[PDB]
Amino acid sequence: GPLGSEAHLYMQVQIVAEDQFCGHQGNDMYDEEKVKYTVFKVLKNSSLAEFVQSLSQTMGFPQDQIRLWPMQARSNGTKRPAMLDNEADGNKTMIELSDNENPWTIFLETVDPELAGATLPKFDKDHDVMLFLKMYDPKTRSLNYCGHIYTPISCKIRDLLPVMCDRAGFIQDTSLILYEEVKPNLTERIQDYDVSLDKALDELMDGDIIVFQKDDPENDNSELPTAKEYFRDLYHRVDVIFCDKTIPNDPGFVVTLSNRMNYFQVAKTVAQRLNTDPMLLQFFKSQGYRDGPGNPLRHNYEGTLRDLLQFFKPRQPKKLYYQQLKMKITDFENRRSFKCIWLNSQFREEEITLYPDKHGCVRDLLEECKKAVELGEKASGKLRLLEIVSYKIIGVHQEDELLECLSPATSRTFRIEEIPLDQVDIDKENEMLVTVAHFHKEVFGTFGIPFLLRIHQGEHFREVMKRIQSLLDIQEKEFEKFKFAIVMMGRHQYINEDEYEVNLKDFEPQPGNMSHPRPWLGLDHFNK
Ligand SMILES: *C[C@@H]1C(=O)O[C@@H]2/C=C(\C)[C@@H](OC(C)=O)C/C=C(\COC(C)=O)C[C@@H](OC(=O)/C(C)=C/CO)[C@@H]12
């Protein structure tokens, strides 16, 4: 709006009291966006002494009870209180002390208004340093402002250990770990307490910060055992929205994490936020273009959370998608669907998907299906796996074969069935299984449900027909309507059903030839 004629002669002076330092969890003394100031509009060329007496009357403390420490920015990017000499700069101008920083911030040390009172201790500009103290509690992972101290440069670090303990509520003689909080993402441990402050601290200045904590075994029970780790985590912090993909339109919940986290750490933060096993969750990389879940994140991901978020533009809402699982994410990742046909005791087909071990044998699949189905009444209770192509059985698979060695279900159907009673242990000297398929007129025109059939040497074809129809169930002048043939690689010829006696070697391959083209029995009727 309209600036006054003499507005350029004035400057802003923001006074911060030490109560603003209490509760601060970050680096330095306060957050510039949360701090509350007492604001003064003062002439740029008023002197320091004028401001001091003015401020002393404004705040209600005599000049004996207050001291001014300008908040000066350091070369390393921090802002810290700094020394200001009363009877050597008290007549320099406010703006020349300011170094032309127009909103000029100053920390006002006062005596506790609890007294008045004894005045602030004197302070030798040359041999004394004002240090700031923070205590780090690893159990609550928190910072606790512990005030400031006047101390001689020559004082030994060990001599500061009492007051620290005193200000933290620790019992005296508690062993401590001490750090200088140099700057964000740099917390340097003070390794020798038996040396002076000027030797122990990097570039000893007024406004330096010592963070201290107990030396305690229980520290290792926290996610952040040291102040060093705490400040690293804080520097790498980032809020991320998490959304369940299975719940449509979910707004999801904000979780505070750190850019340096690996898969296990973010998984456990989110799992405790959801109260589940971290292993019963699956996460998804971002699609990287528009909001929506991307590719599944393998549980053994080697990257960091920063890699997962690198595609979010500098102010896009960071968001990751997950879903909750019914099994551990490892088993979820290694399960493989095997879809096949279960043929029940009624001779009817159903589609069933089993999830055995991807490295299992055929027996694993057979037992997975046996757990799912109701078997026949007084039946064998043992299952077998058949491979069907174009309505013909081409193979019986033995239980020791590896599953991954089987052709995928891509027009080649697999059929699990219970073995009939007459087929569990056939007479190996005179009894044989042959495959049976339905065809119409010509052999390559197959249809229907093929099956395995036991036949006996010397038997008359009549009884083969009887057991065929017993397992098939169809009107008898419907069953009598059709013919029977023996088939080998396209060639076929019919059995005289009036009087033929079953000779097994009419159905036998060439001796020594276990190849997949075996002779089979064909039923020749009409379809539907
Ligand atoms: C943040 C702590 C708090 O909640 O209040 C304590 C004190 C004040 C707010 C102020 O006390 C004054 C000015 O009278 C100044 C801030 C502190 C004073 O501490 C000292 C003794 O310098 C810092 C905190 O107090 C402590 O450090 C305490 C109570 C240590 C336990 O003896 C704030």
Side-chain angles (χ1 to χ4, degrees):
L3 277 80
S5 149
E6 309 189 310
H8 62 102
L9 304 182
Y10 290 83
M11 68 185 294
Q12 297 274 95
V13 179
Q14 305 165 337
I15 288 294
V16 56
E18 200 161 0
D19 68 284
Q20 294 300 297
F21 304 174
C22 295
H24 182 50
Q25 299 302 295
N27 297 57
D28 289 353
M29 284 66 188
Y30 53 87
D31 179 351
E32 264 288 348
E33 298 201 297
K34 307 197 201 96
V35 62
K36 300 155 162 5
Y37 296 124
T38 302
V39 180
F40 297 80
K41 209 184 217 63
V42 317
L43 283 176
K44 278 172 174 163
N45 63 40
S46 41
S47 58
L48 176 52
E50 309 171 84
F51 183 71
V52 173
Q53 78 182 342
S54 161
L55 168 74
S56 148
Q57 186 262 306
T58 304
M59 315 289 291
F61 301 102
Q63 282 197 229
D64 313 354
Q65 296 189 336
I66 61 103
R67 191 171 255 116
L68 300 201
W69 305 84
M71 299 299 300
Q72 186 185 119
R74 298 181 172 182
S75 57
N76 61 14
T78 60
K79 209 183 186 181
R80 304 290 188 80
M83 192 267 325
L84 212 58
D85 194 358
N86 212 346
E87 302 108 280
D89 324 288
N91 302 288
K92 300 171 75 68
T93 80
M94 283 299 272
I95 198 186
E96 78 175 78
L97 304 174
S98 147
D99 201 9
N100 302 309
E101 170 142 79
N102 197 315
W104 188 29
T105 311
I106 300 170
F107 159 52
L108 163 71
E109 173 185 12
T110 84
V111 310
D112 180 0
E114 175 50 9
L115 289 48
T119 65
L120 287 191
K122 172 205 163 38
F123 180 91
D124 167 53
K125 313 135 47 199
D126 291 303
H127 309 106
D128 271 8
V129 61
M130 188 183 54
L131 283 179
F132 283 90
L133 300 175
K134 299 168 173 185
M135 184 267 284
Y136 176 65
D137 175 27
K139 188 200 92 62
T140 63
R141 287 153 300 175
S142 55
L143 286 190
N144 298 106
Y145 184 64
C146 278
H148 69 274
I149 55 186
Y150 292 172
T151 176
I153 312 304
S154 64
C155 174
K156 313 244 149 185
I157 284 280
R158 188 142 260 139
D159 300 340
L160 316 185
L161 299 186
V163 56
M164 291 180 181
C165 287
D166 212 329
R167 302 206 177 172
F170 299 166
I171 302 306
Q172 290 298 331
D173 295 286
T174 306
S175 149
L176 299 178
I177 307 169
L178 270 53
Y179 307 85
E180 169 173 21
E181 172 201 330
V182 184
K183 76 193 190 178
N185 202 27
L186 186 48
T187 311
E188 266 309 315
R189 192 178 133 252
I190 297 158
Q191 305 203 355
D192 195 353
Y193 303 167
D194 298 303
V195 308
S196 68
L197 275 162
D198 64 297
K199 263 75 190 84
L201 277 79
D202 187 61
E203 282 201 294
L204 186 67
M205 294 182 50
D206 302 310
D208 276 357
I209 293 170
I210 304 197
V211 191
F212 66 94
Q213 70 178 77
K214 280 161 78 142
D215 187 28
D216 215 282
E218 215 215 317
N219 292 346
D220 289 308
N221 293 341
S222 158
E223 285 285 82
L224 299 156
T226 70
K228 185 182 189 69
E229 279 166 289
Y230 169 80
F231 276 116
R232 207 164 277 166
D233 180 277
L234 177 86
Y235 179 83
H236 289 296
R237 241 179 225 177
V238 58
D239 279 354
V240 171
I241 302 157
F242 278 94
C243 264
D244 196 327
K245 66 173 307 209
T246 58
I247 293 139
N249 239 344
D250 188 4
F253 53 102
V254 183
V255 200
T256 293
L257 305 150
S258 151
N259 272 328
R260 285 185 42 246
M261 295 183 102
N262 60 30
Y263 179 91
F264 168 80
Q265 300 168 328
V266 49
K268 187 42 163 259
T269 315
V270 181
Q272 188 243 7
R273 194 76 175 279
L274 296 172
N275 194 8
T276 37
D277 204 1
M279 276 168 313
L280 308 188
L281 298 177
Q282 190 182 52
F283 297 86
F284 298 82
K285 297 184 185 171
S286 84
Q287 186 232 66
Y289 295 122
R290 39 169 180 66
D291 187 336
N295 289 325
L297 187 60
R298 53 189 336 129
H299 86 285
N300 65 343
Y301 182 62
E302 273 145 282
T304 72
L305 176 60
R306 185 198 321 277
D307 309 324
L308 302 182
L309 306 182
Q310 69 191 287
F311 303 108
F312 291 95
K313 275 288 139 217
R315 266 170 322 203
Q316 251 188 291
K318 322 273 219 187
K319 180 196 298 185
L320 287 172
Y321 288 83
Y322 73 98
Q323 74 175 1
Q324 308 220 37
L325 274 37
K326 307 176 230 300
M327 63 210 300
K328 298 157 86 78
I329 190 184
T330 316
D331 307 320
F332 189 72
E333 286 174 354
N334 303 280
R335 87 206 271 252
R336 291 289 197 279
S337 94
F338 203 103
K339 319 189 130 178
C340 57
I341 298 301
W342 163 240
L343 184 59
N344 61 34
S345 39
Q346 295 68 205
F347 209 67
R348 277 201 279 284
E349 295 183 302
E350 331 185 351
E351 317 257 347
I352 189 171
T353 298
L354 314 150
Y355 307 88
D357 179 30
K358 72 169 70 132
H359 317 283
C361 60
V362 156
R363 172 189 277 264
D364 297 288
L365 176 81
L366 285 190
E367 216 264 309
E368 217 61 72
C369 171
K370 179 166 179 151
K371 291 192 260 156
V373 309
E374 178 186 0
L375 291 80
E377 203 77 43
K378 197 232 189 83
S380 77
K382 204 51 211 53
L383 299 186
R384 63 182 178 203
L385 172 81
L386 285 52
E387 199 173 86
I388 306 185
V389 174
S390 310
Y391 303 95
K392 291 192 298 185
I393 299 156
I394 67 175
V396 200
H397 289 265
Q398 204 109 333
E399 300 170 27
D400 43 299
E401 290 187 56
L402 270 155
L403 281 195
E404 62 192 333
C405 274
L406 292 179
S407 301
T410 37
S411 83
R412 166 173 284 77
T413 167
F414 287 100
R415 190 170 93 197
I416 296 174
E417 71 191 35
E418 188 174 24
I419 307 187
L421 281 178
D422 61 324
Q423 300 185 5
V424 179
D425 199 44
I426 56 175
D427 184 17
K428 305 181 258 235
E429 191 122 1
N430 314 278
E431 259 169 3
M432 178 182 40
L433 299 192
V434 307
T435 61
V436 198
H438 312 256
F439 76 104
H440 181 84
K441 165 204 195 210
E442 298 229 340
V443 298
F444 180 55
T446 51
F447 68 90
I449 293 170
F451 57 99
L452 282 151
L453 165 71
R454 170 194 63 93
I455 68 165
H456 197 113
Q457 191 141 250
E459 223 175 29
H460 203 286
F461 206 58
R462 307 168 319 87
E463 296 239 358
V464 179
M465 297 157 105
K466 319 282 236 189
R467 68 172 66 94
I468 278 185
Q469 190 163 9
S470 99
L471 298 205
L472 262 204
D473 322 289
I474 177 71
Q475 175 38 249
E476 298 145 83
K477 64 137 163 70
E478 217 281 353
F479 181 99
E480 185 184 38
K481 272 164 122 202
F482 68 78
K483 307 198 61 61
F484 306 77
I486 300 157
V487 192
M488 179 53 168
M489 280 202 64
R491 293 297 180 178
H492 73 297
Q493 188 72 3
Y494 293 72
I495 302 176
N496 173 266
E497 47 250 45
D498 261 16
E499 280 141 320
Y500 163 79
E501 315 222 345
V502 169
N503 184 9
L504 296 213
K505 191 205 175 73
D506 293 295
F507 296 88
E508 272 177 310
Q510 174 188 254
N513 201 342
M514 297 296 272
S515 83
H516 57 93
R518 267 165 261 110
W520 54 281
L521 176 67
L523 321 174
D524 189 341
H525 37 53
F526 174 61
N527 202 356
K528 188 225 72 167

